[PDB]
Amino acid sequence: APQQINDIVHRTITPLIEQQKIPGMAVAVIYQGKPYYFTWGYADIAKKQPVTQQTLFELGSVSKTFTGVLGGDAIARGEIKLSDPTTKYWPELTAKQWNGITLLHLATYTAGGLPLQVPDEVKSSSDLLRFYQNWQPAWAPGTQRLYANSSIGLFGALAVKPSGLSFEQAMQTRVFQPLKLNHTWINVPPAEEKNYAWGYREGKAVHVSPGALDAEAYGVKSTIEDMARWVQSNLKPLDINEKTLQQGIQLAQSRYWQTGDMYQGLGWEMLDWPVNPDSIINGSDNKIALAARPVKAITPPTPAVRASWVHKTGATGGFGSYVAFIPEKELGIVMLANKNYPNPARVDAAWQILNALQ
Amino acid sequence: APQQINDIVHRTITPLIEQQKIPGMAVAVIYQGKPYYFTWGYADIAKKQPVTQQTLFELGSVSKTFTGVLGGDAIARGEIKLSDPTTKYWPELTAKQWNGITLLHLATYTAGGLPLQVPDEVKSSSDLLRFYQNWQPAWAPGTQRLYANSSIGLFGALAVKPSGLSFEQAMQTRVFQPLKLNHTWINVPPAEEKNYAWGYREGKAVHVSPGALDAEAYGVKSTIEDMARWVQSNLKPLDINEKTLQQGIQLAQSRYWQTGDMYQGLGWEMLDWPVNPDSIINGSDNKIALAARPVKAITPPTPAVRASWVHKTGATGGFGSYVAFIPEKELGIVMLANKNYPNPARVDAAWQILNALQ
Ligand SMILES: *[B]([O])([O])C1=[C]C2=C([C]=[C][C]=[C]2)S1
Ligand SMILES: *[B]([O])([O])C1=[C]C2=C([C]=[C][C]=[C]2)S1
């Protein structure tokens, strides 16, 4: 790749891998619409297996971007409406507090305080219904944003209801295949187990644990090659053949709510570019990222803005991921590590690199 | 054209012209994407000039659809947001009532009672400011719909402001040229006057008179061939090369408000397909079409629904037009006459014709 790209990346990431003590890392820089890959360390320290272009990484919450786009596609297909009441897709969700909660609230974390996590005890479908039936809101819908798996996860599950397909099958056929993401999985199959990296937390090797709505909120595993494609597709959706997916990617980057200098899309979060580095860096700290924040409705939603810094952090017990891109500059980056390290460290590194290239 | 199309068309239009005493008429049916033309009578009864595929007709309010799409292209360009307050584009608009009135309210007739017509006495730019400064809302914005030229017209004037172009130039440059609408004009040039049909009001030959915001609200003149191209462009916008125009068209067919079983877009009006003929035919009568009706906001707006009956009526002193199409079926029709006759009569004819073709 151009000396330029090589230079910043080495100077930025290599030291970061050292300071954070990251076992393995794959980085893809999309420059002028083209990807360049960088690789470091092991995918498995025990077997001294290295990180390659085919190593599978748990994306954590970056999965939410897939869920948001699957949702956008279902809307363009005419199968769902964001203005539709929740109970319209789950008739048993009868409790009165669910009355004015629509799919939009579920998708953007503005339903009124649904919890970040679905309790570990909730397992059966029964457990899930009872949990939602008993939930008491902390705020009226549409007033506060509270980042949560239990909100977007339910959105994913109801969004695929009309299609009659399971969440995984709707995702593979409607999103993975058309984009040719031939190595992205919710449930990695036998054949891919050997490329599936171990996550590392406290020197021990881990893989994400099953849980309710895990697939809908954080269950995707992928490679830097597919992820790079994922970023190219999101950078230039008009280049996408399938009509509903092209429109879905756009709906996913529309601005529905604003809080501070951030805008909430479906899965994706956006900021006007140029961006204030302190802002995105500090804002990514979990003290802030996980707190409730009042939101201002954007009426009507602003369609996908080219001059945006679009991004999403993800993490699981032993994995730390990050994606960011600026459509207007055909610039984007993907960072996958088999170690969960500080969000501010990822965002800073990404900002150094991208700011350097335009 | 196929005898099927030819037969339905003549069976339906012939008695209509007879019944209504329409001097001349042009009709185009878009079947499976291809257009088919039909013409009858005179463009100029005095000089016995026949109506042809080159005859120019005044579109009347059908012009609001062009204005809506021009607005949408400007949103797609990032030059304006429908969520912005009117005063962000007209600072001199100091009156307090203008506080929470957005571009969306203006584009959809929900500002709070803006009048149907701008008074004839309003001629100067200053005259327009005064008129708007002294206007007193009847209702809160976003609560009632009142069809108005003073509302959508102001929207068109403000939407082109950032661009630095005049309304006619932005329209030619951003909508007409790209779609190859080469015989569509706001001001018909001397070279084209010979094709400009006369309108007929109680036996007298008339052309539309100038008025404040006429260009923006009812100023376009076109031919049956360009209108067919206009219909095809709106039926399949994803076939448009221009990125922002293709987006603009989709934004104009999105659903922002609902009233009865009608949905309001930017210029365009829609109903779910299949549709009750009487649901349209009746709702069309100028008495029912311009009255005060409360609206329900669609939050967030539903993207262009393929299964809809999309249409718009238009009339000037001597002209009556109608446009209707069903994307899902790639079917549409355009009817241009140099006589302003009953709206229900147009809708009835259009329905007979399209219903007969699937
Ligand atoms: B994402 O990586 O921000 C996630 C946050 C949590 C997940 C699962 C369980 C609890 C928090 S995925
Ligand atoms: B459209 O054809 O419905 C129109 C309605 C009016 C126009 C001009 C002046 C007053 C009403 S165009």
Side-chain angles (χ1 to χ4, degrees), chain A residues 1-357, chain B residues 1-357:
Chain A
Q3 321 168 118
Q4 241 179 2
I5 298 178
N6 262 168
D7 197 33
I8 32 198
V9 175
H10 190 225
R11 302 202 198 223
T12 313
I13 309 326
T14 312
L16 174 79
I17 281 142
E18 301 322 308
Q19 281 137 215
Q20 296 301 148
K21 305 182 301 173
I22 294 166
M25 181 134 167
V27 171
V29 178
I30 286 63
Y31 183 70
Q32 284 181 342
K34 300 227 299 109
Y36 299 100
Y37 312 93
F38 305 77
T39 251
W40 295 264
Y42 308 115
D44 183 329
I45 308 152
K47 308 289 179 165
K48 273 134 224 118
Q49 184 206 317
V51 167
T52 70
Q53 313 284 303
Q54 307 178 1
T55 304
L56 280 186
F57 284 94
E58 285 171 12
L59 303 181
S61 286
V62 169
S63 293
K64 299 185 162 60
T65 62
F66 281 98
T67 295
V69 166
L70 176 53
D73 174 85
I75 294 152
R77 274 177 199 268
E79 295 168 348
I80 66 160
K81 277 188 222 104
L82 282 182
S83 42
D84 285 345
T86 296
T87 310
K88 179 187 194 122
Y89 303 96
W90 200 0
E92 313 154 322
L93 211 47
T94 278
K96 217 228 161 317
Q97 74 280 16
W98 281 92
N99 222 247
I101 303 188
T102 65
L103 288 192
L104 167 69
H105 303 304
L106 285 182
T108 54
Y109 326 117
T110 51
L114 274 161
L116 163 74
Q117 251 171 271
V118 169
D120 282 15
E121 290 93 344
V122 180
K123 308 178 170 172
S124 158
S125 304
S126 301
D127 286 335
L128 201 59
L129 166 68
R130 194 172 99 234
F131 164 76
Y132 282 115
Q133 273 292 75
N134 287 147
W135 172 73
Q136 270 319 136
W139 307 284
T143 52
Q144 313 289 331
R145 168 194 192 270
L146 173 68
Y147 186 75
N149 293 333
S150 78
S151 191
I152 194 151
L154 184 55
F155 171 69
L158 311 178
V160 300
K161 286 299 212 227
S163 79
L165 311 167
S166 72
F167 183 78
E168 171 152 49
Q169 118 185 88
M171 187 70 80
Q172 310 258 338
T173 57
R174 275 129 100 114
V175 186
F176 298 164
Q177 300 191 333
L179 289 190
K180 260 123 118 175
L181 303 176
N182 303 330
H183 299 283
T184 303
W185 299 93
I186 283 157
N187 285 108
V188 350
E192 297 263 31
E193 264 150 29
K194 61 154 175 30
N195 305 127
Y196 190 6
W198 272 114
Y200 289 107
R201 174 204 232 249
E202 306 297 2
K204 296 173 251 133
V206 287
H207 271 166
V208 77
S209 247
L213 306 182
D214 51 6
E216 292 84 345
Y218 57 79
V220 191
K221 289 98 209 186
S222 194
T223 69
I224 13 73
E225 287 198 347
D226 276 7
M227 283 307 301
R229 286 168 199 189
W230 179 236
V231 172
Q232 296 192 105
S233 317
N234 277 268
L235 270 171
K236 295 207 292 170
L238 300 184
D239 275 16
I240 289 170
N241 304 308
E242 297 267 335
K243 295 174 194 179
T244 54
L245 186 55
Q246 173 201 122
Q247 292 159 8
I249 281 165
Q250 301 187 90
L251 298 184
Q253 297 174 29
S254 294
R255 285 128 92 114
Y256 299 91
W257 302 97
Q258 172 170 22
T259 188
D261 56 12
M262 170 200 158
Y263 295 93
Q264 186 64 56
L266 307 176
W268 294 117
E269 286 163 30
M270 294 84 48
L271 283 100
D272 285 328
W273 173 265
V275 111
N276 181 19
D278 293 286
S279 196
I280 53 179
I281 293 179
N282 294 151
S284 73
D285 190 85
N286 283 160
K287 282 165 191 200
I288 301 193
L290 302 192
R293 243 85 174 140
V295 284
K296 175 188 164 28
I298 294 163
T299 306
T302 305
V305 166
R306 266 124 244 171
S308 301
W309 166 276
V310 193
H311 73 159
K312 190 73 227 294
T313 49
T316 55
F319 284 91
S321 83
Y322 184 67
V323 187
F325 60 87
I326 318 163
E328 182 173 86
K329 309 274 234 183
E330 307 219 20
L331 198 66
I333 182 160
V334 177
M335 293 173 201
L336 312 171
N338 51 0
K339 188 211 178 33
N340 194 348
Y341 60 107
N343 278 331
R346 338 190 175 154
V347 179
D348 179 18
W351 161 263
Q352 287 170 75
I353 294 165
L354 289 198
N355 189 222
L357 305 170
Chain B
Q3 230 198 333
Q4 173 195 42
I5 291 181
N6 166 269
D7 285 5
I8 186 190
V9 170
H10 276 97
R11 257 175 213 12
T12 305
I13 308 291
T14 285
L16 169 53
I17 288 145
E18 232 135 53
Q19 262 245 94
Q20 304 296 157
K21 284 179 181 178
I22 297 184
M25 184 152 168
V27 171
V29 181
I30 285 76
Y31 185 83
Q32 278 174 34
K34 176 176 190 180
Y36 298 100
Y37 309 108
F38 304 82
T39 55
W40 300 257
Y42 307 73
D44 185 337
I45 291 172
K47 295 173 176 174
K48 290 117 152 178
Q49 291 303 309
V51 162
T52 66
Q53 281 164 231
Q54 284 71 43
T55 302
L56 280 160
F57 289 88
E58 277 164 23
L59 294 188
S61 287
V62 166
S63 309
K64 303 181 160 60
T65 60
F66 282 99
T67 297
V69 170
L70 179 56
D73 169 83
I75 292 159
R77 279 169 192 278
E79 304 190 330
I80 71 175
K81 274 172 244 262
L82 282 173
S83 52
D84 291 334
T86 299
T87 55
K88 177 196 223 91
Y89 302 98
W90 205 3
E92 299 77 87
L93 223 45
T94 279
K96 73 179 157 86
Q97 75 263 25
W98 281 104
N99 185 57
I101 292 184
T102 63
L103 289 179
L104 173 78
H105 300 315
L106 286 186
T108 57
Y109 321 120
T110 56
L114 273 175
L116 169 73
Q117 334 146 86
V118 174
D120 263 7
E121 22 288 305
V122 188
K123 286 172 185 192
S124 104
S125 245
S126 284
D127 279 350
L128 212 56
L129 177 55
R130 259 197 301 283
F131 166 77
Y132 282 109
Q133 275 286 65
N134 297 147
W135 167 70
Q136 292 173 11
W139 323 287
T143 56
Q144 208 107 55
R145 180 202 187 265
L146 189 66
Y147 186 77
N149 285 338
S150 75
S151 186
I152 187 106
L154 178 51
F155 167 77
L158 300 179
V160 294
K161 300 271 285 136
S163 96
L165 306 156
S166 74
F167 183 86
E168 171 175 32
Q169 305 177 293
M171 185 64 75
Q172 252 148 3
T173 280
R174 281 132 99 128
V175 188
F176 298 167
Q177 293 172 27
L179 298 183
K180 269 102 149 227
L181 309 188
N182 304 304
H183 300 280
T184 301
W185 321 88
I186 275 142
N187 290 116
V188 332
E192 296 267 87
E193 259 154 37
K194 56 153 185 357
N195 290 122
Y196 200 168
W198 278 109
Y200 288 92
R201 223 242 200 95
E202 284 178 312
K204 303 204 181 246
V206 304
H207 274 163
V208 70
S209 262
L213 311 182
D214 51 0
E216 299 84 345
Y218 53 89
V220 182
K221 283 108 223 178
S222 202
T223 63
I224 201 56
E225 295 196 13
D226 279 14
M227 282 316 282
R229 225 178 255 101
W230 179 232
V231 174
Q232 297 176 112
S233 306
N234 272 280
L235 269 174
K236 317 210 107 168
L238 291 190
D239 277 11
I240 285 54
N241 300 317
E242 302 26 76
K243 53 192 206 266
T244 65
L245 188 53
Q246 164 192 140
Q247 253 112 74
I249 280 149
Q250 286 173 129
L251 291 187
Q253 300 182 43
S254 291
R255 298 154 168 214
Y256 305 87
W257 308 94
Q258 179 180 18
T259 170
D261 40 30
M262 180 226 99
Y263 296 95
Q264 179 69 64
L266 310 180
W268 291 115
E269 289 164 27
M270 297 97 11
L271 285 91
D272 280 316
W273 176 262
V275 65
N276 181 332
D278 263 323
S279 196
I280 7 188
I281 309 198
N282 204 314
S284 74
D285 207 284
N286 233 214
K287 249 150 245 190
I288 272 210
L290 328 177
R293 298 264 252 9
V295 288
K296 159 205 256 162
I298 297 190
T299 331
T302 313
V305 162
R306 228 195 44 172
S308 327
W309 166 278
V310 188
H311 73 160
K312 183 100 245 308
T313 57
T316 53
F319 290 90
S321 72
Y322 187 58
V323 175
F325 59 96
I326 309 153
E328 211 204 12
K329 315 285 232 152
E330 267 164 65
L331 204 48
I333 185 170
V334 181
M335 309 179 246
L336 312 178
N338 55 346
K339 213 227 207 209
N340 177 13
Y341 60 107
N343 275 340
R346 324 187 183 173
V347 181
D348 209 323
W351 165 271
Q352 280 293 52
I353 290 142
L354 297 197
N355 177 243
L357 306 170

